[PDB]
Write a protein that binds this ligand. Structure first.
Ligand SMILES: NC(=O)c1ccc[n+]([C@@H]2O[C@H](COP(=O)([O-])OP(=O)(O)OC[C@H]3O[C@@H](n4cnc5c(N)ncnc54)[C@H](OP(=O)(O)O)[C@@H]3O)[C@@H](O)[C@H]2O)c1
Ligand SMILES: N#Cc1ccc(CNC(=O)c2ccc(Cl)cc2OCC(=O)O)cc1[N+](=O)[O-]
Length: 316
């Protein structure tokens, strides 16, 4: 299948990208170097991941080695929750650019629809464990995102973890200048997102599936939580194709016309994860994987469930 998907700005976005959350600064430079060598062009980043410097080191080295040119790369980052104020947006984007050593991003996302109290702390909590919000709203933050495109800092803007009503809010904004190009959402066999995907795709919004392997390294995991990579039913599908479970889990969203961004810092896995253009999941496989849905979110926090813009009260 084609390796890129057309965005609403006429640019093409590689459907397979490298995730970088939890890729430690001490190990991510090599991860990104290897990724580039074996063919990844899309890298998913974020200021909150606190490793954009080191990702930037890897990109700079591969540009200088003449392994890739800037135009071939598709670099994504995200505006963190503590920078939703219209006056903070450009500075946040420029810090990301400075750290990545880039002069533009291919795509910049609102990381979560929620604004958090501005300050040094990424996750300000109050004495009883609830996040401290900011008095910002989706539409004003979007307007600030639009300014970034008009200033040439970013080629496309989008959103992440927005429910369909929050997407609709942007789409219905009087004087909207740019539609969101992408909604990046959690998506895998345990959370198949049929309704939000159908909604987004019907609105001309490209969907990126995050945590496609089930984010086994997430810091709030419980030992009794369901584990995708270890699911015997998926291992069986993989063995049938002489592929790994991870390869099946990456190919799955690709065949749903989604972009997918598996994370690894392990060079062997980074290479393995990219080798998913040489097989196809059958109808039956696709159906079987979809049937494993349990509306189970690996990326959601109790501490945010009182925020006025918490996205997961809605069905989708
Ligand atoms: N927008 C958002 O709110 C949001 C939320 C979550 C994630 N994301 C993005 O999506 C990316 C991917 O999601 P994720 O990081 O949550 O988790 P994921 O990609 O579902 O899983 C990554 C985990 O799987 C392991 N792994 C990778 N390849 C493997 C393989 N072939 N075999 C066995 N294990 C393998 C990794 O180990 P090693 O790295 O140790 O090899 C790591 O522990 C993130 O890094 C981030 O870029 C965005
Ligand atoms: N609102 C909200 C909200 C915010 C965050 C989360 C979960 N994410 C994190 O706790 C997180 C924290 C630090 C880092 Cl570096 C990465 C993280 O996740 C990966 C990512 O967000 O990309 C959940 C919610 N929420 O409303 O459910």
């Amino acid at each position: 299948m084609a390796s890129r998907i057309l965005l609403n700005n006429g640019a093409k976005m590689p459907i397979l990208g490298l995730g970088t959350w939890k890729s430690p600064p001490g190990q991510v430079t090599e991860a990104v170097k290897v990724a580039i060598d074996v063919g990844y062009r899309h890298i998913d980043c974020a200021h909150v991941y606190q490793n954009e410097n080191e990702v930037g080191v890897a990109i700079q080295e591969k540009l200088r080695e003449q392994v890739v040119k800037r135009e071939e790369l598709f670099i994504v980052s995200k505006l963190w929750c503590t920078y939703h104020e219209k006056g903070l947006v450009k500075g946040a984007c420029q810090k990301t650019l400075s750290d990545l050593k880039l002069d533009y991003l291919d795509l910049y996302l609102i990381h979560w629809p929620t604004g958090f109290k501005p300050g040094k702390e990424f996750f300000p909590l109050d004495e009883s464990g609830n996040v401290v919000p900011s008095d910002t709203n989706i539409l004003d933050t979007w307007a600030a995102m639009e300014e970034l495109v008009d200033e040439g800092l970013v080629k496309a803007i989008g959103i992440s973890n927005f429910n369909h009503l929050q997407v609709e809010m942007i789409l219905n904004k009087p004087g909207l200048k740019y539609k969101p190009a992408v909604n990046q959402i959690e998506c895998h066999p345990y959370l198949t997102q049929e309704k939000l995907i159908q909604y987004c795709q019907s609105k001309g919004i490209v969907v990126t599936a995050y945590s496609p392997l089930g984010s086994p390294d997430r810091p709030w995991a419980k030992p009794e939580d369901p584990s995708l990579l270890e699911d015997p039913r998926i291992k069986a599908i993989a063995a049938k194709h002489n592929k790994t479970t991870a390869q099946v889990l990456i190919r799955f969203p690709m065949q749903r016309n989604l972009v997918v961004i598996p994370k690894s810092v392990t060079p062997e896995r980074i290479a393995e994860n990219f080798k998913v253009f040489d097989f196809e999941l059958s109808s039956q496989d696709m159906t079987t994987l979809l049937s494993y849905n349990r509306n189970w979110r690996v990326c959601a926090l109790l501490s945010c469930t009182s925020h006025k813009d918490y996205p997961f009260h809605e069905e989708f």
